[PDB]
């Protein structure tokens, strides 16, 4: 496929440098030019700089321009993009396009790199029970959860009964309580299963390798 | 820079029904050479922008009779015709007639159905949590429509923000209503010295709030 693949999503404590690579095959490289842009959290999908390759010069936007460095190696197709001393705010995912001389447009894009900037240690969760304070028969149904909370980083995946409960759970996202996340997750269940038929949260965070079961035990 | 500013957020939509987002600049974008660098893309969950239109009504390929689009210098209206499955997503709008090429917000082009007020719960902190110090209190709004909610946390009676971090979850593909959920945290004592903790949801479908609560 004609396509520009780019690299790896990696974890920077800020004061750092990342270097993003981008390749082009299928294409004639020199023929268009290589564009970033940037997608930060609910932000401005906004753009980087532009770095044509019949010359090798770039040209920025005011804002990313000379902390941000852009580069090229042509006679291997690669596009670079190294962010230096990496602010928190330089949290985003970033994209590269091949950009068009003609109708100027941007029409190949490549899936993104990732960089989570952070100063944070990698934290195993601590996954706590959600039981009701003993709401009744609230119509049918019962609704429980777990409380991952205080992990660092990204991923947990959580789950119930190994997975035999999906229709009811509603995993919501994570957020940032100080440097570390914390997520949580609901199931509801009828009223005749808990606590007649065990429900557990299952929760394994990776990137520390631990898994913690948490039975939903009554109050 | 040239501000790009779209309209709706969320477009609620019946797949088979018309569709229409529109789009508006800054500046103009007819340019030096008699031309308009307006462009379309569509991001798609979790993924990556693919142009659809470009300069005002061309399609890229691939893409179907069903897209369309309009307009000059200052607004401009993109139409999908039988809006379907495949369709849904952010919708951003850019143009390229200047410098710096400036990007435009979106629209997400979301599902509308019947409403469905929060089935809400509030659930007290925990041995462990308690043990550690600190209390999470939990309040799940849920299985609702449409987005807007919002979340008091009533405390005796006397209000609160601090702590309260609320997060909520796209569109169920399986019955298109939302979800949400906000954790109030308190110290292990801020917890133990009050009774009465509720969280109060304002949504449309009632008039009333809709208060869950328990007395610590
Ligand atoms: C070849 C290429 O990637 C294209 C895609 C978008 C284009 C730019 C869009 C903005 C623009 C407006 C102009 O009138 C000067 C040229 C520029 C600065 C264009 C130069 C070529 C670009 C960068």
């Known amino acids: 496929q004609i396509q520009l693949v780019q690299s790896g999503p990696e974890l920077k404590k800020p004061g750092e440098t990342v270097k993003i690579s981008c390749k082009a095959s299928?294409?004639?490289?020199?023929?268009?030019?290589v564009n970033w842009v940037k997608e930060a959290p609910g932000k401005e999908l906004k753009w980087m700089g532009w770095?044509?390759?019949?010359?090798?010069?770039?040209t920025y936007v005011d804002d990313f321009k000379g902390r941000f460095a852009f580069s090229l190696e042509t006679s291997a197709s690669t596009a670079y993009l190294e962010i230096n001393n990496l602010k928190n705010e330089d949290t985003a995912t970033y994209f590269c396009?091949?950009?068009?001389?003609?109708?100027?447009?941007?029409?190949?894009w490549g899936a993104g790199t990732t960089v989570t900037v952070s100063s944070a240690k990698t934290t195993p969760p601590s996954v706590y029970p959600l039981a009701p304070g003993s709401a009744a028969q609230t119509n049918s149904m019962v609704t429980l959860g777990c409380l991952v909370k205080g992990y660092f980083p990204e991923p947990v995946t959580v789950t119930w009964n190994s997975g035999s409960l999906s229709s009811g759970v509603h995993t919501f996202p994570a957020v940032l309580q100080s440097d570390l996340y914390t997520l949580s997750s609901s199931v509801t269940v009828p009223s005749s299963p808990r606590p007649s038929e065990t429900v557990t949260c299952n929760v394994a965070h990776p990137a520390s390798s631990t898994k913690v079961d948490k039975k939903i035990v009554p109050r | 820079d040239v501000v790009m500013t779209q309209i709706p957020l969320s477009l609620p939509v019946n797949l088979g029904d018309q569709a229409s987002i529109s789009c508006r600049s800054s500046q103009s974008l007819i340019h030096s050479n008699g031309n308009t660098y307006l462009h379309w893309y569509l991001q798609k969950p979790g993924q990556s922008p693919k142009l659809l239109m470009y300069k005002v009504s061309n399609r890229f390929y691939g893409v179907p009779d069903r897209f369309s689009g309009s307009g000059s210098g200052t607004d401009f209206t993109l139409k999908i015709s039988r809006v379907e499955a495949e369709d849904l997503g952010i919708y951003f709008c850019?143009?390229?007639?200047?410098?710096?090429?400036?990007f435009g917000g979106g629209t997400k082009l979301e599902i509308k159905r019947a409403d469905a007020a929060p089935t809400v719960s509030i659930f007290p902190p925990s041995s462990e949590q308690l043990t550690s110090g600190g209390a999470s209190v939990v309040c799940f709004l849920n299985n609702f429509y449409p987005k807007d909610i919002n979340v008091k946390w009533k405390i005796d009676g006397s209000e609160r923000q601090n702590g309260v971090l609320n997060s909520w979850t796209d569109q169920d593909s399986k019955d298109s209503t939302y979800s949400m959920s906000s954790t109030l945290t308190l110290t292990k004592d801020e917890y133990e010295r009050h009774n009465s903790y509720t969280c109060e949801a304002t949504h449309k479908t009632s008039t009333s709030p809709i208060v869950k609560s328990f007395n610590r």
């Open positions: 770095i044509n390759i019949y010359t090798g010069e770039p």
């Open positions: 850019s143009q390229s007639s200047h410098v710096p090429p400036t």
């Open positions: 299928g294409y004639a490289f020199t023929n268009y030019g």
């Open positions: 396009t091949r950009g068009d001389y003609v109708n100027w447009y941007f029409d190949v």
